[PDB]
Design a protein around this nucleic acid. Sequence first.
RNA 1: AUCGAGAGGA
Lengths: 1131, 67, 117
Amino acid sequence: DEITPDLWQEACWIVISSYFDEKGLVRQQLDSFDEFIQMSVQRIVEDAPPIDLQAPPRYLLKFEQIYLSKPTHWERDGAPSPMMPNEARLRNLTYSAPLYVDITKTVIKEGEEQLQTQHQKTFIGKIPIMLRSTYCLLNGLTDRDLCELNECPLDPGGYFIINGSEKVLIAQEKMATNTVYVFAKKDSKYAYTGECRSCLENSSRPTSTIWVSMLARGAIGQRIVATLPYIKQEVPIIIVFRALGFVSDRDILEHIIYDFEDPEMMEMVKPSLDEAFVIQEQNVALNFIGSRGAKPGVTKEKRIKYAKEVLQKEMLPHVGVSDFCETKKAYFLGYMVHRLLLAALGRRELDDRDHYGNKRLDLAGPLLAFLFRGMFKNLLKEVRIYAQKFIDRGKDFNLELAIKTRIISDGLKYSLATGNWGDQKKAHQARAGVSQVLNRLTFASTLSHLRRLNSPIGRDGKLAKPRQLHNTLWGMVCPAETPEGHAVGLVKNLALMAYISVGSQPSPILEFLEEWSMENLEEISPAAIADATKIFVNGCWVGIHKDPEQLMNTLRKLRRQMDIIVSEVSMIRDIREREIRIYTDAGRICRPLLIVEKQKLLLKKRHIDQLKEREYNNYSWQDLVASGVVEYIDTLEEETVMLAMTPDDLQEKEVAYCSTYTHCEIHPSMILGVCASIIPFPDHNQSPRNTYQSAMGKQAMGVYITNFHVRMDTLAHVLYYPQKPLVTTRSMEYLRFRELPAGINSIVAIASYTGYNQEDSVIMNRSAVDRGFFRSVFYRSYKEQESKKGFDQEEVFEKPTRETCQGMRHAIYDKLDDDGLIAPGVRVSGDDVIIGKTVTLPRYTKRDCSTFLRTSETGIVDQVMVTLNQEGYKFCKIRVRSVRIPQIGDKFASRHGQKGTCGIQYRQEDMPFTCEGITPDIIINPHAIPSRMTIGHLIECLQGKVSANKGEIGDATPFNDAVNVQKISNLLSDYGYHLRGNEVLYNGFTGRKITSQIFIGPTYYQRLKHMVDDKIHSRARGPIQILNRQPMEGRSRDGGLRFGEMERDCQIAHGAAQFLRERLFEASDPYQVHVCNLCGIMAIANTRTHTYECRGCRNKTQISLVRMPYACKLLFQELMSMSIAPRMMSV
Amino acid sequence: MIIPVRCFTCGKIVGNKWEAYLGLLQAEYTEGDALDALGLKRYCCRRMLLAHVDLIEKLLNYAPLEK
Amino acid sequence: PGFVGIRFCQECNNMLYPKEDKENRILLYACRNCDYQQEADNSCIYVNKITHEVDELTQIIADVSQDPTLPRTEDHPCQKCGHKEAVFFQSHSARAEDAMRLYYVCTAPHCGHRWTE
RNA sequence: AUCGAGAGGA
Ligand SMILES: [Zn+2]
Ligand SMILES: [Zn+2]
Ligand SMILES: [Zn+2]
Ligand SMILES: [Zn+2]
């Protein structure tokens, strides 16, 4: 029955495999989008108010149902056809499906003359579709079906195709809503502040933040204030309580202080009462609120109405926005004050801003919902204006012409295309970085980009606290994978078994709590709240309970049985403070864990047995979760959980550590993400090395996707001979690194050989490189289109001619065909022409606008595709193919942060060799190891020697006590090798033995995208910028290198004044001006007629020539634009 | 994508051994014994056969450009 | 000394503020909303414990013994019920510097005795 | 071509 330790390493990984058979790696994206389409769009459409318009006749126009068909495309003839994602990629279409809404317009004029007209399936917009979602044409297709459609079966999906560009929505971090968080700002007028970003269940407005603060000590005592929304002045809490109908001080403290035996709380609230005694009735308090507001009505009536509306709608919407909710709002605001007092009295800890239990991940669904709310509101507005301008004339109108569908369509398309998350007009208030271009450089880069999280703290911020690896990231975020540049700690990555909750309605839970012995908050007396336990659901205090323990037992039983409580519902019992917080909302990152009985796992051997035959008896992960054996625990419920790292922790020990565990890790290696799960032996490296590899696995070459032959990507690198690593971890089985690997096993020798590998460099074998070692192919796609925008000027693909075309370069166009397009198989060098495009003029009647190769490439045309774009003019894509043979300067890396460029390449006779004539493919310098402490590199090399000599794949899973260095060495000594991986090598040049026995063996190396040929650049009098006549910027522009301020300072320190003048004047922008010797302002010179005159001074004899930079002339002219007179006085 | 022709290290021909290697593996050989049957004694050539991923078999799941 | 609690009027249920009656030279507690008055019984109006000599045993609740994440010990039996097992934990409360002190709670149900060594 | 944004390198 029990899984014994000897079977555990199989059982756990069997369980893990079942998880990845059920979910995958992009499950969060697909589930978010599916919830958005199934629920969020319908909720948004129904939550909009019916637009009642009347001059008389009236019309309501109620939207009642939505229909999202499959993705289709409409040609110029208008025939709807099912559009495949690959066709969208090739034709630069948007993989979107039409959204139709049912509309009901009832005519009501008078005399009960009512009649309803329903417009079924009114086309309301087009919604882009996430690939492999339920509403994707690739849904449920087999691998054969996907290959029939020219799709990769290993492609995870989880992205959109907007204008042929694959866009991926990055999950955005945000502070959780409807939760009270008591912080303390050191530099502020308030000692403690308790904030609550409140938002109603079905979002319709932004988060309304309410603060309840305490004024810092230094009138008599510490005063509690409340910064309500839409009010620009602090308001005493007692005033707010009275404005809600609680005038008696006893009632207010009944709502705030639940234990009247506690004078400390009492004296700390007393200043607030003493400050609010002149105001003692609800109307006066409402008048005070309205007066403190930023729109103080001259008459107290409208002041009181405004205060009523604010306190009913903007104050704590999550508690309830309807009327008669003042009791719930009073109880909740009293809870906020109670929490603030507990913090000020030291009875509760301040809340941690960085705790991921306090955060939420805004995924594709809830982000598209924000867009859709804004866009549907704008659409209903436009419909209101259109219908109003017609009914004002007293006649009917056609809603089909009122609905301008471009709002929703173009809005979603623009937002996903650019990443600016918001309305196109508010292009600066909008937050960019959402919806990035999917990284297709290697399969690991694609997976990681699809599992990418973002902390929008702002890269400019230099506070390290949000960048720090918090304790609560354990199991939810990769500890290693993070960019090492300016976004350290802000851009994160999901751990492998991390699941972001999609969201759920609290209705069944609330109903069960009602049927259960919970007492509502309006029905109780406050005297009961002392000993009772509060119950919050999605931040709303809904009631109280008397035995929280057996309530938690009941709820956990219900969730483990897949009863009314779904698996993703978090249920935290804080014991010391008697809250029970239940969460069903979306964005809660959680992970699966094995539940533990008294001191035993519930995962018995029968579950492993049924999981082994997963493909026959359809016993899956969901059956494991439904059995009550596995549980999803979120960051906030982990605080109440006692984990076992392994079932070995559940053994009874000579001194028991815990003996009351509640859960167990499925495997600790699941704390790593996609790119860190490729590192072998990451627990033997320094952690920065693991981070650098997690970044560098994403630039590694491989086969980024199986269907690369049909993709017209702008840039693509494919390795000739990708190999799976000889030394692998058990997590790559689910990353599909074995099916799409990104490196080669290289016989690497760590040695000092000729000095060409010093300081992070490598010596490669020229003979190996000749045999296809780390050879790659680079595919570059050029796009072009001939626009017939108007009869004024039209472009067209056609072989240009020297007699008709004007802007025709001296490059030869013979490689083009009569259609103007080069043919595949044609070898093209730099500056060559691949598309001959000519544009009609207003060298006559047509000008050359041909597409050249990006300079200095020298490839062969791989293929040419011709089609029609969305509007329907001819559209061409040409993929050119360039074989990249590794060379000096190309960057290579192992899986341990050990990067370096090729210093030199030696032939096989020049490389050092073992007694059996094995030469290293790569030689790396021993000095790269000691400071870096990448012992995982050495253990991987030794394990790889054992694996190659044994005919197996080494197990480098991080935390594995069945694999240590002594075992690997003992294994290697059985194959006739030195147990530590050393060998006697001979000098290739002289054949003499090397005195020091070299450490050599197979290690998995990666070829990175950074090849020297894509970086080398030179300039000598090339093109210049228009504004300031200085060299351009970039290799692509043939630009010059920037001689910056620091270079100026260095050369000033050198004392090299002529070199400094050459760099900053003569090699950048030499220029001449003519200055009036009297006024010092630039004069008018006419060198052809030799007439120089200053219009200002009315002189034409006292002019002087001045040699100045063009940028300085431009500066002085831009100062004269500002009415400044910079007078260059030559005397 | 396809089995290399030569071993990158020594230059021994491994191109003619992939199919035989697979046939030995379905014959219930261990990978080590299979590599021994094909005469790959240096761990470089054993690396070549043992770490190869036949991606061409997946690229042949797509219909060609011309019928 | 001990703290002093707030007391409310019997008519308006607002807090009673302190006042002095010169006629009898006696402390009274009177409401500044209604016209109620009361004869005080403590004679103390304000108390500040600067030292903050708070007995944290009063802040503990027996329910904490149900926490699986707290450590348990068999070495400190309960003086009230004789149960062997007991959870222990530190103060973890602000304004307490010498907070390495351990507080124990009996894990027996319905006993919930709390103490300190 | 410009501008902006994003992703990256040292
Ligand atoms: Zn002048
Ligand atoms: Zn070889
Ligand atoms: Zn009174
Ligand atoms: Zn006891």
